[PDB]
Design a protein around this nucleic acid. Structure first.
Ligand code: ZN
Lengths: 180, 205
RNA sequence: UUUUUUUU
RNA sequence: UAAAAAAA
């Protein structure tokens, strides 16, 4: 339940951004895929009132009602990379549920450019969650899946194609050099 | 197949058409990703610059449909030889459109449109783009009950039947349905310079 | 979302 | 005052 404009307003993030200065917030998009009966659920979480969308989505999974029998391959396409502390909350919540396997795909490597948020997401890509930045498909996946692709179109048909490619080309190599 | 059909490919298209006796030609170049189901195309009118709606030409641009790895991609395997397709579109007000096309990328199209009413939504340009239409596939045949949006409300319906035939025999798939969405990304006032975007993905029936 | 460097 | 690119 997103807007086509909001997609590029929050997911598209260049090295030097657009004409308005830093009008950007953090979003998360969880795609829970129960393969038992092929019963998928989807949802977006804005960065809410001093509770990062990671903790909000963790509490959503908590208070929604889980099924301890089968395994879930949950994908999560998020705009801004998770910070240090909520990444540790995420890995602690994933260690308690062995029937969960999560993939994390970010759009921009958001952090305070200090030391804690460097290894805060290095444990994920090395212990439980393969963490890489978005490319072409995961954007195209999150584009029509989460953001409503209904009748109207807010003049963003393929402008992302070049911006998605710039973001991939730069930040994916950045994230690979980080993981290495 | 994957070694010759790269993840990014361009094409060139030449169309000769005649609608209600008005002859014209269209030259275009495009680019996209065949395995991800996205493509864009830029067209230019070279003759007759069009007295009719451009939307009747958009559904004619199919080798860029995303197929799962466990579903044989019938249209991709036809290359490098290519394929042909022939389409008949009967509009509800008597308009008829017959299209033939060869794909080898080099596309050669021949189009003939006849019997369009002078006060109909096609010749009067009262259309607002095509609605989403799920085409069920089962040579390969496809039938569409397509709906054209009207400016004043309602829909303008048409029956479309298309036959796609590959130049080389390959394994035919089972029953499936393709979700397709086409968008006009940019156009001038007289629709002489048009860019189009297409997304297509197959699903099990 | 904060720094450092090169070029037009 | 615009904009291209790279390092942590
Ligand atoms: Zn956080």
């Amino acid at each position: 339940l997103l807007t086509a404009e909001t997609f590029r307003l929050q997911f598209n993030n260049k090295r030097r951004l657009r004409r308005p200065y830093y009008p950007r917030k953090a979003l998360l998009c969880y795609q829970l895929t129960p393969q038992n009966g092929s019963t998928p659920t989807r949802g977006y979480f804005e960065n809410k009132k001093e509770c990062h969308a990671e903790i909000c989505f963790i509490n959503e999974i908590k208070s929604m009602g889980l099924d301890e029998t089968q395994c879930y391959q949950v994908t999560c396409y998020l705009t801004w990379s998770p910070c240090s502390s909520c990444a540790w909350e995420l890995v602690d919540f994933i260690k308690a549920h062995d029937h969960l396997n999560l993939r994390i795909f970010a759009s921009r490597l958001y952090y305070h450019w200090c030391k804690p948020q460097q290894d805060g997401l290095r444990l994920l890509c090395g212990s439980q969650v393969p963490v890489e930045v978005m490319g072409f498909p995961e954007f195209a996946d999150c584009w029509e899946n989460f953001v409503d692709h209904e009748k109207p179109l807010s003049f963003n048909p393929y402008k992302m194609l070049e911006e998605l490619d710039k973001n991939s080309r730069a930040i994916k190599r950045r994230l690979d050099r980080i993981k290495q | 197949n994957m070694a010759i059909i790269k993840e990014f490919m361009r094409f060139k298209v030449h169309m000769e058409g005649s609608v209600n006796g008005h002859e014209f030609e269209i030259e275009g170049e495009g680019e996209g990703r065949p395995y991800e189901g996205t493509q864009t195309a830029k067209l230019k009118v070279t003759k007759g610059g069009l007295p009719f709606a451009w939307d009747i030409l958009s559904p004619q641009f199919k080798a860029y449909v995303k197929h799962p790895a466990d579903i044989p991609d019938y249209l991709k395997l036809s290359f490098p030889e290519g394929f042909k397709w022939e389409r008949v579109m009967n509009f509800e007000d008597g308009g008829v459109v017959t299209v033939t096309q060869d794909s080898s990328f080099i596309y050669k199209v021949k189009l003939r449109g006849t019997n369009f009413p002078s006060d109909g939504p096609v010749m009067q340009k009262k259309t607002m783009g095509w609605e989403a239409s799920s085409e069920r596939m089962y040579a390969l045949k496809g039938e569409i009950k397509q709906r054209l949006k009207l400016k004043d409300g309602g829909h303008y319906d048409a029956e479309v039947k298309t036959t796609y035939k590959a130049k080389k025999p390959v394994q035919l798939p089972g029953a499936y349905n393709v979700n397709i969405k086409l968008d006009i990304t940019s156009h001038n006032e007289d629709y002489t310079i048009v860019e189009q975007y297409e997304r297509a993905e197959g699903r099990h029936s």
